[PDB]
Amino acid sequence: TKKSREEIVKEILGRANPNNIPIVDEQPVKVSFKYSLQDIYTADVGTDQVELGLWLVISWKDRSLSWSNECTTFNELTLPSKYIWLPHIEVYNSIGKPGIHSDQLVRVYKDGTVTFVPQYTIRFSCALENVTTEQGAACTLKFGPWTYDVRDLVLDESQQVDLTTYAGGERFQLIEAKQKVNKKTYPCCPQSFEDIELRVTFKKI
Amino acid sequence: TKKSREEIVKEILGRANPNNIPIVDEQPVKVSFKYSLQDIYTADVGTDQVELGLWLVISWKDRSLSWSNECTTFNELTLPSKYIWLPHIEVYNSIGKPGIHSDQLVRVYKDGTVTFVPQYTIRFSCALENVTTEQGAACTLKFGPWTYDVRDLVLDESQQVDLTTYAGGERFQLIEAKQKVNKKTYPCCPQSFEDIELRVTFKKI
Amino acid sequence: TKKSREEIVKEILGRANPNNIPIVDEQPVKVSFKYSLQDIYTADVGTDQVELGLWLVISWKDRSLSWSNECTTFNELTLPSKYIWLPHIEVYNSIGKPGIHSDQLVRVYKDGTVTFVPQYTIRFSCALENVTTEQGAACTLKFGPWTYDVRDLVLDESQQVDLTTYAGGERFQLIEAKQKVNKKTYPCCPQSFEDIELRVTFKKI
Amino acid sequence: TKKSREEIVKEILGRANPNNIPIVDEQPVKVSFKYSLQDIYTADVGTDQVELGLWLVISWKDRSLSWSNECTTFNELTLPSKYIWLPHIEVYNSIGKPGIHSDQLVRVYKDGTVTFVPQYTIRFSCALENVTTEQGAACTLKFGPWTYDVRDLVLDESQQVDLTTYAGGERFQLIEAKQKVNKKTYPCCPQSFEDIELRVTFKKI
Amino acid sequence: TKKSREEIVKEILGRANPNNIPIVDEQPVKVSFKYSLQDIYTADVGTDQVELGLWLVISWKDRSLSWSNECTTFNELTLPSKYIWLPHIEVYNSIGKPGIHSDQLVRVYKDGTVTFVPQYTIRFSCALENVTTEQGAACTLKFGPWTYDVRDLVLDESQQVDLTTYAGGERFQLIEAKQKVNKKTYPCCPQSFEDIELRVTFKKI
Amino acid sequence: TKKSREEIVKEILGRANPNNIPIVDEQPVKVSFKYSLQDIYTADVGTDQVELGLWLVISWKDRSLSWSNECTTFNELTLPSKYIWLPHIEVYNSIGKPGIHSDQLVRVYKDGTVTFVPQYTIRFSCALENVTTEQGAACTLKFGPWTYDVRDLVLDESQQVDLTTYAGGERFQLIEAKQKVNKKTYPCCPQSFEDIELRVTFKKI
Amino acid sequence: TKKSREEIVKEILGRANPNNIPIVDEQPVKVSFKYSLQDIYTADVGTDQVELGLWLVISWKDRSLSWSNECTTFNELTLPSKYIWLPHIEVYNSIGKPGIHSDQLVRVYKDGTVTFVPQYTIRFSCALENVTTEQGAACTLKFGPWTYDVRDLVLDESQQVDLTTYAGGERFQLIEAKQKVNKKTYPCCPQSFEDIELRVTFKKI
Amino acid sequence: TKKSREEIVKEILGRANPNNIPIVDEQPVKVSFKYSLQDIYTADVGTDQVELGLWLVISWKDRSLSWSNECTTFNELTLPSKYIWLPHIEVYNSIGKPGIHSDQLVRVYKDGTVTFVPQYTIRFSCALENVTTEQGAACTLKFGPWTYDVRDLVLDESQQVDLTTYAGGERFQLIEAKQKVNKKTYPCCPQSFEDIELRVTFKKI
Amino acid sequence: TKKSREEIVKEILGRANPNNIPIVDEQPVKVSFKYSLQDIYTADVGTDQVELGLWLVISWKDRSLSWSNECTTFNELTLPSKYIWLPHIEVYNSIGKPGIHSDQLVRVYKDGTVTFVPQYTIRFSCALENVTTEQGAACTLKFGPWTYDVRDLVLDESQQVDLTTYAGGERFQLIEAKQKVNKKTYPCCPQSFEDIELRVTFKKI
């Protein structure tokens, strides 16, 4: 459509950079992570797995170069996620491969900021037992870079959990959704690793 | 981010080596294998298959070249598993293709040591019968290079099995997890092959 | 710790390269230089020397070879500066040998990029006179490879000077810090040499 | 298709065993034999041969090794008969080589049990005379291992003969089909040999 | 590791040949096929499908060139199946895509002989009915090149079926496993096609 | 690509055989024929011709020789139809030369079986009259070897006609598609000839 | 194997043509379609989906060039389906992605004719209701090029449906299988599209 | 001929795969089956056997790997059926071994789809009685994987039967050809098996 | 003209290779496919066929040998398509043979990459109905190797569809052009086949 926009895409995609961390100076890359819990689709007592429909908000800043003098033009362009590098964030205890609800498209900004929000259905281990009871049940899943240590990737969160999107007539009510950031160590490695633990406590309406 | 780190990745990835065993001298490659049994998710009586959530610790040393004089820099870099060669270790009797819980990221070290730990959900043949009984039930699965003989790949293990990670409120209790290394022969080939037999004995709490 | 990381270090350090410029093709090595002026510790009227606490950001790309197929592993490793070749950048007019605040550690990246940032206390010639006056005083020191001509080493700078780190309650206020790159010639040699002139203008609060 | 299934085939086929009787302990191999008489296609008065369309149910247990821990996976795999050893059972008095209606595929089970059912058209000696008469005619053919004595192979049968499959509008009606097991001796050898004598008595409708 | 081995791989892989049948003279390629029935994992009455865990032994000779004078060196090398051409052998009546238990690795020999054994879980059509009965049930599946006629590919089998590997405590007992080679014709084509019919007869213990 | 595959093609193509029926023994060649009626594209009232988009499944077995010992290799290879002999099957009453939708490629199998499926648009004589009426209209076209008598070529069919592929929103609805095999005689020759009569009865939706 | 064959493959594959319709003159490509209904594996009342095991015979003629003078050589070569262009024929109402029973191999002939027959398991919408009743139930699925209009692709069928292959002891009996070609129009496009409607009427035995 | 084509064959044949079901994930292989009834060559009253000249269209998808970047090249290659795995589909009640009219060549496509169409002459049991009468006679033969259950192989059909190819002056007229898919169970096995029942009803002209 | 160029052509054409897939190692050939929809020339309501003027971008890599040391010379040479092997890609549902707008010339590169772009006019089945309406109409045609399965040929696409070339004053407006890659199975064959489905949705301006 717009020629101005067209040059933007081409310049960044063609000339700008291959998979590599563009930032030479000592700076780790921080990725903000937010969860919007859309719905708790199902619970399996025998399996002890629960399914969550979530969208993950991920934001990071990449270094981009401005070759052509930027003029008032197309500020944000949308591109497929494949085009650019994305973070490794994954659920530590997912029973199965997560499925993707939405297309992989990411908006990029001139400053270099990128916003990618996938929609996912994830199945993770959690005992459903006592969902019916008033107390309800609690489940926790931790998300975080598999490979990256705290040094390489720093995870940050704005708030606890986004309930607002939550479906009004979901099978299960949400007593409370929390996303607490924590740093933890593994026997594999001396480096600290940061993950966000999403603890959802819910019960049947 | 850090320019110093950036050169490291590029040098190893771009210039350093294609899929090939870099070691010319007569040295087999040893891969240490460790299992952290996260949880026994499910048992299927009709199917006679059991599902395990495990993460596999795999360590090996690859030969790398240091072109640029290494200065105090980024000691370990994380890269996707696709970038580098990984071992063939697979479960001998998996009913289905294993699924991958975590992203494929591997930490590499200047010495050339590489640590890759995938998280897996594996379904393997095992009769659930008498899980309820006090004696419990025993299952065994052997892991080992499919193609590689003992000559090419040597498998080593530090300890029996890592129970500590095991989920506290798992459906099944772990009576004992063992990883014994054994060498075995097949009618196909005169070469000895080494596999680690993971024998888990568990019962319902 | 991580075996994967361990191989990385060993491969680059042991096999990869001795002090030599790994780059055969006609390419000069560019080193980006940045100054973070931490503080102006002291001024000596009689001596006419001033002391600066700075950290120097230095980035360069070295050619590294990837022998073992890189897998997702330790992306950046940290090593002592002694291990790898570092640039000669020195202050042209330092009254005394600079002292080193921080350990000599440099992060290296797979791409081969290396980031080394030393912290230094440097004493250089500059007349303190009229520090008290509103106009303040100006000092200049030039940094650049002693031996290397522009051909061999090219110096680049991202920005003027990093004030942000500057101590809030420093004895002297910073009117402006600038790092301008300049190329200059010496009677010794017909080759052009590039240095970054750090001109700081400061006064007592 | 399924990776899990794929390993199964390969393991048994590649590594598991060559033509050899895997059973070291003193155990003869018993093969159950059953006949499903599909139809009596034709009778030749001059030739005195009769043609039967039958499928032979053959079951035996072979010893298999489970290397990889069996997980819930592909329980039964189908493979060509050529892949595994089959019994020698043949009709003692076949006028001509039997033809094979169906592909040679055999289902194998983890326990090691194998079920192979070929469909055959067999021509054997039998006088057609008096087919038209009410009494009808009787024919007998014996099936049994040619080489194997009772010691090596034991033959067993569940029932007399399977009439149900028999074509409704066959040229000849089945007065009675019987499969009696008998052990017999031959002048060649002192060992007893077991065969199943299939005696069919039929007449034209 | 060994340099000698390293050259071997590179020479065959890099220089030796693309997907093409290297044999110019009039020679069909024969592929020996063997089945090791690991276990009959499951039976589905409603589905009328049975699952087999098998490993398939496949052997063939490819023409290779020896450039460098072969010295006493690494006789057999292991490589991924993707690297070299493999035969099309597939189950004629598989309900679903077979899954692969083991990694795709194949051992190659200097003579050019190649041994590839995949482990598979295969689901094929077969009526489970009367498994409980003493007679048991019979199933047949035929394996053979889909495309290749007898002219192009010839299939051979050493023995009937490998029971030895069969799991001792499998859900189903193996009455007999057979692999008979047969040549058959299809209305599509005048050429004869060869397949191995694997007929397994099994029952519940 | 694969060297192993490469030899296969070359051996069969170069050495294996010229246009000639490779089968010396007394065996006619049977060709299975199946029709997948993709769509009835058009009807011409004046012309009284109808157009069918069909793909023809043709299978036959050719005798191939295996020179090089077949190892586990490329089971089925694809080659152009020109390379190998194909059957003469043609529509008896085609108004015009049939056009070919798909490339002429045929898969061949080691057993010698060949599967060739062309896609065709054929125009044949048939009165469209009363397509609109509820009764609809019937058309018949017979396919069969022009030259070959029943002795030389035998035609076989698995089923009546494959409706499933039929386009959902085709101009004409399919009341019933049948493929009945019939043998017929011509005054030219005393030999019986076999053809498959495809009778399609269709009407406008 | 045969050198003569080898050249054939290479010439057609390497030099002969990329995905493009080789036919410049005004000729549509006709693809004959035939269905061999192997078996009706299952019916799901709740789902209202039925599963069919079919093989599709597809034939088409592609234009090939004969560079080297063809001598008596390898007439038909087998190659992978990926190598050559195949038609888009798909089931209009498939509930799920079809699975492939057989390897994708296609036989090609010198004339350019290609025969490709895949084996498929397809799940399509159809109400099972009243399968038990004597009347039975009817299901219809239409196959045809998704994209191609009648102009581009013409579908033709030889016969109604191939019952012969149908499994003798299938769960469901086949009252009649028909493949009627029909041309239909869609609101999307003014062009006529041709599909083959496969209507199968079956009941439980 | 074409070098590009040549590499294709070699890569798939040599490197790509041995008889094994390449599909690890849980996918059954579906094979479409179509029958093109070329002609009903003969009927034998005494024998009660009928001969059909048919070609069988078989299509299946195999998993292939693309090593070399595919460029516009030879899309479909033809290879002998022996080269690749073919399905076991066989006539349940064939009186004699089917003969093959055509060479076993199969076209393969890059996507992996394979089309194999054999031409066959098949003799199956069927009473000729009352062929002369107006009502005619009906015969049924079922085709389907011998070994494979519905799970492993799924059969699908596009249409009823392809009459079009049917010879115009065949000895017998085709009243209707049908191919209905049905699933059936056998006492041997609890798994469902799918077959295509080809029911042809024909009479003398 | 240039002698240097002249040797290039001769060497590749004369000495380099016949139709054969030059790639011995296990590598499938991938062919990238792109469509540039030039114009929708016509729609035929009665015929239900639509005509597209497209050019097909096809790219693949062939293995070439460099005999003479390559010096700076003619990098890309143009040759007739007949000279080298081209892929089989064809439209599944083309009503008629496609015509060729442009000469068959292909550019080849030293790396072995080949780019061939034919211009075609294709007629495919599609209902024109409701072109006038605002909603417009949708048509789909699938392109893909006829013979080649996914194993042999892998198809890849860079983008959805190239609208830019589209004629400004075409009879029909393009609402959206998409090229989605899909893998599908056919009943003929167990192998997966990949095709690109071109779905164009257009309406009259």
Author numbering:
A (entry chain C), B (entry chain D), C (entry chain D), D (entry chain B), E (entry chain E), F (entry chain A), ...: 1 to 205
Recite the paper's sentences:
They are homo-pentamers and water soluble homologues of the extracellular, pentameric ligand-binding domain (LBD) of the membrane-bound nicotinic acetylcholine receptors (nAChR) that belong to the Cys-loop receptor superfamily. In AChBP, the pentameric quaternary structure and the overall subunit features of nAChR-LBD are fully conserved; this also includes the typical pocket-like active site at the five inter-subunit interfaces, with several strictly conserved aromatic residues for ligand binding, and a C-loop for controlled access to the active site. We retrieved full-length sequences of two distinct subunits (termed BgAChBP1 and BgAChBP2), encompassing 205 amino acids plus signal peptide and sharing 52% sequence identity. The resulting cryo-EM structure is a regular pentagonal dodecahedron ∼22 nm in diameter and assembled from twelve ring-like pentamers; each pentamer measures 7–8 nm in height and width and comprises a central channel that is ∼2 nm in diameter.
We docked twelve copies of the homology-modeled BgAChBP1 pentamer into the 6-Å cryo-EM structure. In BgAChBP2, the putative disulfide bridge C16↔C64 is lacking, but residues D25, R63 and E70 are conserved. R2, R3, D26 are substituted for K2, K3, E26, but these isofunctional exchanges suggest the same role in inter-pentamer binding. Instead of phenylalanine F71, the single cysteine C71 is present in BgAChBP2. The only possibility for this covalent dimerization exists via C71↔C71, since the other four cysteines in BgAChBP2 form the canonical disulfide bridges in loop L7 and loop L10. However, such a particle might not exist in vivo, because we could not produce it from recombinant BgAChBP2. Recombinant BgAChBP2 formed many pentamers, indicating that the protein refolding was successful, while rosette-like particles were completely absent. Alternatively, BgAChBP2 might exclusively form di-pentamers, with C71↔C71 bridges as covalent linkers.
